[PDB]
Every structure is written in C-alpha cells, then in structure tokens.
Amino acid sequence: ILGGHLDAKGSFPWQAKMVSHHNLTTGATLINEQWLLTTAKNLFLNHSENATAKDIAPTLTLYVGKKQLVEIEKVVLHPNYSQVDIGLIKLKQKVSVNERVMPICLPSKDYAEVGRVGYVSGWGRNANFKFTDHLKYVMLPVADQDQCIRHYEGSTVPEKKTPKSPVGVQPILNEHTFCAGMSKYQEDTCYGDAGSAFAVHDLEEDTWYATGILSFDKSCAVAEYGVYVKVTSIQDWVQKTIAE
Amino acid sequence: ILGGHLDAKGSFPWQAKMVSHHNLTTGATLINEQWLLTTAKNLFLNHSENATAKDIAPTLTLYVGKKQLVEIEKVVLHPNYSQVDIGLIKLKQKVSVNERVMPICLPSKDYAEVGRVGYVSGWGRNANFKFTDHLKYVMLPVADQDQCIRHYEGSTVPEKKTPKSPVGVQPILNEHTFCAGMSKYQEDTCYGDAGSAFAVHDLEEDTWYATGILSFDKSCAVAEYGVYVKVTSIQDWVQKTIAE
Amino acid sequence: CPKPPEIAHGYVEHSVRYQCKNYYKLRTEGDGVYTLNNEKQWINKAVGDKLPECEAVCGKPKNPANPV
Amino acid sequence: CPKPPEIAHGYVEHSVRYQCKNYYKLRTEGDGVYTLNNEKQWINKAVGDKLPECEAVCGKPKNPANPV
Ligand SMILES: *[C@@H]1O[C@H](CO)[C@@H](O)[C@H](O)[C@H]1NC(C)=O
C-alpha cells in the first residue's frame, strides 16, 4: 500500500497474511471461522500453471491477527479462475475469534456503486517498494466501469481492444469485476495487496462487509485503478463450497 | 361415640388420641405442625386442681395418625379455663404431614349457626361403655343456645338457674359456647370424646374447619346436647400463644 | 447438576426453582426462583438469599368424609 | 451447583441458560433455556436435548477504522 494510514487500532481483524514458499507476501480475508477468501494468482505464486489445489496447500504459510500461525487444510480454486481470480482457503481448526481475529461479513446488498468509499488493508509493498512492516489501509472509491475498461484496454468493443496498461501487465476485467480509482492523492494498492477485501462500512447496520477482493494489485500509483472481484458475483459458489 | 360411622377411609387426620397416666383416653385436635387444641378438663384428668402446666405435660401420652407417638414439649392452659375449657399442647418436633396426619384449619368465619351440621370424630366410649377400638365420627347439628341453657340449667336468668342436668354433672355454658343436638337417632358423644373438633366442611372453599372443641362429653345420649367451645372466641389467644 | 453439557465459547448461568411436596405449600414473598451469581450465592429477585419455606396445608383431607 | 440449599419438605428443579461469550452469538431455534428432567436430561421446550451453538460474529470490529 502506497501512502495511507497505519492500522494502529487494529481495525481489520479479518486481514490475513499469506506467504509463498519463496517469501512473497500476499493477502487473504477471513469470511468464516474456518474459511478465507483470496485470489487464484496468489495461490499460483511461485508455482507452475500445471499445479493443482493439493499441490498448492502444503506450500502456503498463513497468519492472522498478531503474527498468529493457522494451519491450512486445503484450498479450492474457483472453477473459472482465469476470469474470476478467486480461491478459498479452509483451515483445519476453527480460529478463535477475538478483537484481533474476526471474519468480515459477506454482503446481501450490492455496494459497488461508482463513488462508494471502501477500506482496503494490505501487507503489500510501500513507497520504497518494500513489504510493509505493519498493516496499512487506504480509503478508495469505486470507479466508473467503462472508464476503467477504457484505460486498461482499447474500448468497450471486443474487436477494438489493445493492451495500453501503464504497468504493462493486463488486469482481468469482466462482469464479475469493479474498479477503484485513486483516493485523492498518489496513494494506492501495490504488489502483495491482492487477496485483501474492499471493505464497506454499512452505516445503517454498523457492519463491515467484504464488497470486493482485490485481484489486480499492480497499479502501484502509476496506473489508475485497482481491479476487484465482486463478492456478490461469487457468493453462491462460496456458500456451496463451504458446505463442503 | 355412641352409634355413628367408622372412620374407615381415614378422613380425620387432625384427630389425636391423648392418654392420661391412669389409662383414660381423651381427644385432641391438630391445628398446626407443632400445636394441638384440647380441653383443660382433659389435662387435669387424674390430677388435683392444684397441678400446674409443667406438672401435667410429662404425665401425658399423645398419638396421631396410626398409633404414632409424638413427644410433648409443654402445655398452655387458657388463662380462664374455668369458663373456657381449653388448653394448648405444643410438640417438641414438627409432625410430618401426610394423609394420616394433617392439621385442621382455624376458621375466619363464624359457622356456629343453629342447624349447621358438623362432624365430630372421637376415641370415646361406645354403646357398651367401652373405649372404641377404631376412630368413629358422627354428624351433629348446632342447637338453639337458649333451649340448651334451659335444658342444662334453670333458665336464661341467672337468679333462676338450677342443676337439672340429666347426667347430674353440669356443663360450662357462657358466651364462648355453643351446643349440638342429637343428630337424628340416639347417637351422640360420650366420655373421652372431649378435645375433639366440631369440624365444618366449607363447601365454597372445600376446606375443613375446627368450628368448636368438644368440652362437655358426658351427655351420653341421655342428655340432649354436647357443649363445644367456639374456636372463633379463642382464636386471638391461640395465635398469640403459638408465638410463643 | 448432573452437569449440563458445556458448549464451545459458551457458558451457563444456573437457575433453581423451589417447590413443596405434598402435603405442603410454598411460603415466600418471591416467585421461588433463585439464580446463582458470581459470589456462590443463589439470589431471588427479590427476596435476596432468603430461602422459601414449605408450610403444611390444613383442612384438605386426602379421603374426606361422606357429604352431608 | 454449587449446591442450592435444601429446604424441608421441598425440592428443586434445575434450569440452565446458555449464553455465548464475546465475540459470539447464540445459534438455536429455542430460547437457550434447558430444564433437567427425571432422566438426567437437560431438555429445552422445545428443541429437545439439542444443545445451542455459539457462532462467531462477523464485521463488528472492536476498534473500527476512522469514519469516511
Ligand atoms: C464457470 O464458467 C462457466 C462458463 O461456461 C459458467 O457456466 C459457470 O457457472 C461458472 N461457474 C461458477 C461457479 O461461476
């Protein structure tokens, strides 16, 4: 996370830190006492595209709360993870829920309206290209979907698209996706922030909801928007996978 | 009790059997888990008129239920037992209350209306002048007070009274007293029935009340009425003596 | 007791209700319900820790005499 | 337990009420109250002998982030 605020009060107990077997740090989101949401790209880090779910699980390390290790039982990739960059992690044991470890709610409403402000916490790289030592968060607004597709691709028309990504690497954009623009300065998400939740605070209920999971975390304030997976677009697959 | 019915169902759990140290049997009435009502004449049986309460208590034997001995702590004679033939017995221990041992209620209403039918149980002598082997009861109606005073004395006028008792011995008659005539035959109370309750069954509440304590038990079907102590006329002294 | 089963991340508060056997009645200004608090005390709301009493019933014979 | 005091000619029926600690919520179709019957069984009226569960509360951070 470039710029932003330090999680000094511990306001994101659903944030988890995942580490690959070659010491790359990514994010995950506790949605359950036993389950976490993350991206498929995170799970395939330091692997080949030929790896399976049973191959990936033993090579992962996962922390919640204050550097609290949690054992992983298995992972479940989304059946279409090439368009829906999502994976589910199941823990062997129910994690004990307290003020440092607590799942975020899955939303029943669609909060992904252009302009709605969400909170993104992350262990990703900072302004010095270094993995942050303490958890940071940033407030980002949902961006216009067509302007986002226009910035990272050619146009809305499929037969007119071109790369054009200011970071080179192309994000996944489709119906399951929304974008989040620059807050007000040059603060943004960056490498390692993927898997974290675009958290929305429902002031009517005073409840925090995972509206999105950060998928494209390579617009390190040199491209416009990060790209997030709509949680409402995967909620059905999530509830089915959890049981079981 | 001359004639009457055998207590074959055990319908008088408040009935107690008191025995003097010379084997005379009289009655007492459980009004409490620790207290019983009886007559002063019963307690002075086989004693001199000079005896006190502490003299009488150790010489008594008392049974409740099915020949169940109960230890006596003390007796309390009525301060005016020459007109109110009443004494109170206190047990050392609370008696266990069941279907064979149960106190009768003290009435809040005056049931001593001329003609009201009450039940009198008793261990007294039967038609053969013998103490009965099993508890007996008889249904008797309240008699006219003036006709009763006229039969056992001269008249209502104090300066006109004469003995005239068909049994010779005179009953105590005053304001604290009511009489009970012959039921319908020649069945009545007799020697040893004193201390028993003139029990009234309040059909409105379905509750049995001690309306009177039998004092004069010598009208063995040759005089008209037995004479009973109004329980309502001693209720205040009873509640004060019980505490304590 | 006998020990109510324990549930994970849950706890039990113990209540007790006093009743009298035959042939007795409950004598108390409260409702007879007592709850165990942190001080090892069974408290009724609100006769305090004052326990109920069982008083004998008068004049209710099990087999009453035949009616008049 | 710890043993409610016994009264003469009285008896106790034991009730128990389940509640969840932080940061959990009670998951049950009954009211969480279970009464001990003659068969050494704690019975709720009426989820039966089915015990409650304590489920974790989601999205209620103890120290939420500063508002927008
Ligand atoms: C995966 O992709 C196919 C595309 O043919 C779609 O029909 C299916 O529903 C998708 N599955 C989920 C769980 O979204």
Ligand SMILES: *[C@@H]1O[C@H](CO)[C@@H](O)[C@H](O)[C@H]1NC(C)=O
């Ligand atoms: C006993 O007799 C006297 C008569 O002078 C009367 O005043 C008093 O109240 C009587 N006591 C009781 C308990 O009835």
